[PDB]
Amino acid sequence: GAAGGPGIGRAAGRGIPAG
Amino acid sequence: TMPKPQWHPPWKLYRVISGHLGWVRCIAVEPGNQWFVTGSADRTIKIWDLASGKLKLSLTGHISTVRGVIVSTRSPYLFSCGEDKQVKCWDLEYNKVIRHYHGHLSAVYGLDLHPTIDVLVTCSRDSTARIWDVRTKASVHTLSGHTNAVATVRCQAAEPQIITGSHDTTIRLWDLVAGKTRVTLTNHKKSVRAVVLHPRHYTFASGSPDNIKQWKFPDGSFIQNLSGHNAIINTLTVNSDGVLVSGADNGTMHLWDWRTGYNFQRVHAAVQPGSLDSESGIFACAFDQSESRLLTAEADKTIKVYREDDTATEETH
């Protein structure tokens, strides 16, 4: 089938901007 | 006595190895327990067989006293440092120096390898500690902030990753990422020459001529004062069973229980025949991987090897 691609998942936080 | 100490068997000398022509300043045991390095003021590095005591191989390349020697646990390398200002990597597959790490201004008194990130750290008399990448031979950091000769360094993966005692009587705990002092412990009146980390309990001990003190990581909290060995102590090593060994410049060697600070044995070994009665002195001592032999590097140019008295207990109290 179609090849496995470049993407990776990882755990992250969001972080609200100021304001 | 408030605590009850665990009974530990007394140690006894069984093998006086001899064959260096100067002071044996360092000792280290190979991870597979087949052989052990010594370095000496005869400017040589001698591979000794740990079982038979036979001299395996003599190495040559230094220009002055060899002060620290360490066997790498991950790579087949033998890092050694001297008063040459030179720190060298001996590739044991060829027995040749492949990379030597210039950069220090004066004598190199000791060195330790970080156990998981393959990084060399060295002490120098110029009040600095430098951090070296093995592969690239480049100065990562120059830990400055001691005012006097840095004596001993130990590395661990957990924070604080670098501990240095020095001759200014202060101990600095360093942040490896920043390169800045985290805690300055001043409680010794005289030069800290030895620091040792306990293998299981997250605590470390430090030795100076006034008293040996056990301290708790990460912030360096004071725990206990272990008094009684009043000589200039050079090295401290600890067995996972809680046996602490303090060897002094006057050659007295005390065996101590880590949990209680109980002095269960004092060992004052005898000098090699032609030697002189003030020459008796201990500069390095190390347990093997088995933790059942004690290899001590002496100032009368000998290696004394101790094992444990297997007999049932009378000595206890």
Binding site: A3, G4, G5, G7, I8, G9, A11, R14, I16 | -
Partner: protein, 299 residues
């Protein structure tokens, strides 16, 4: 919370597979990347067949077929298991902005393009069965639930509903002030969600027996900026929540009953083109122009 980098360009569209276990994402890079939802959220496709920007992705209701409308004037049909491009519908003279496949069988598809044509298809035949000529560009189309009607929104602001049987415009809805960038129909088929550039999201009664004024609810709080992107809209599977893409980097979910915001989640750096709900578990993904997909649990 999970972060899914690895698109080299803007991510225009993202859809969960109807079984919830897998995810599709596509955008300006022309690639369609297929992700597992659970575990390490790893990738296991590159779909390569397009030559221009992928504007929208939709699965068929069983999930075996992925439909991608592209600016390259073609609609690709992919087999989800093998990744083969099954067919190429190549009937359109200008950019294909949207597509949507029929809820009920057979495998019908409808499409909206900047050429002003709304073309119905059948996957069996290579040509369009029927073409409705709109006077101006069409930005989003969906079927109704019964698969008999095309609803289209365009830059002419009004919502237009065609009937495939009479071949005629059948009723129109008026109220939006600007280009209808996104249309989406609830799983029950009663209601349509619309996004427009007039900074309003609205819910319309699509049922035959609606009052003369079909606008039931008005929602506010999204922003359309100077990039004029086709910000999409989606329904939650239960119909209790609605999401809309917004260009002010905040991810909006409203409660349909109370008309309040419920989540306004920061962390994207660019315009958010589409937001999608997971079908069973309360997981939400949002696709943004910052080349990232953010995936996270909501309660």
């Amino acid at each position: 919370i999970m972060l899914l980098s690895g698109h080299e360009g803007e991510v225009y569209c993202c859809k969960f597979h109807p079984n919830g276990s897998t995810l599709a994402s596509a955008g300006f890079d022309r690639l369609i990347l297929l992700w597992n939802v659970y575990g390490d959220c790893d990738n296991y496709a590159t779909l390569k067949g397009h030559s221009g920007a992928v504007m929208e992705l939709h699965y068929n209701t069983d999930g075996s077929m992925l439909f991608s409308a592209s600016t390259d004037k073609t609609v690709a049909v992919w087999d989800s298991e093998t990744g083969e491009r099954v067919k190429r519908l190549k009937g359109h003279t200008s950019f294909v902005n949207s597509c949507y496949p029929a809820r009920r069988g057979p495998q019908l598809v409808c499409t909206g393009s900047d050429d002003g044509t709304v073309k119905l298809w059948d996957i069996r035949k290579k040509a369009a069965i029927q073409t409705f000529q709109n006077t101006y560009q069409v930005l989003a189309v969906t079927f109704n639930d019964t698969s008999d009607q095309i609803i289209s929104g365009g830059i002419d602001n009004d919502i237009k509903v065609w009937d495939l049987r009479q071949n005629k415009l059948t009723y129109t809805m008026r109220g939006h002030a600007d280009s209808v960038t996104g249309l989406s129909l609830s799983s029950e088929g009663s209601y349509l969600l619309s996004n427009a550039m007039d900074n309003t999201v609205r819910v319309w009664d699509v049922r035959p027996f609606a009052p003369k004024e079909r606008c039931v609810k008005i929602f506010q709080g999204n922003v359309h900026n100077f990039e004029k992107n086709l910000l999409r809209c989606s329904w939650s599977p239960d119909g209790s929540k609605i999401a809309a893409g917004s260009a002010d980097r905040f991810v909006y979910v409203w409660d349909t009953t109370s008309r309040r915001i419920l989540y306004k989640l920061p962390g994207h750096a660019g315009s958010i083109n589409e937001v999608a709900f997971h079908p069973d578990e309360p997981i939400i993904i949002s696709a943004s122009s910052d080349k990232r997909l953010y995936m996270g649990e909501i309660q």
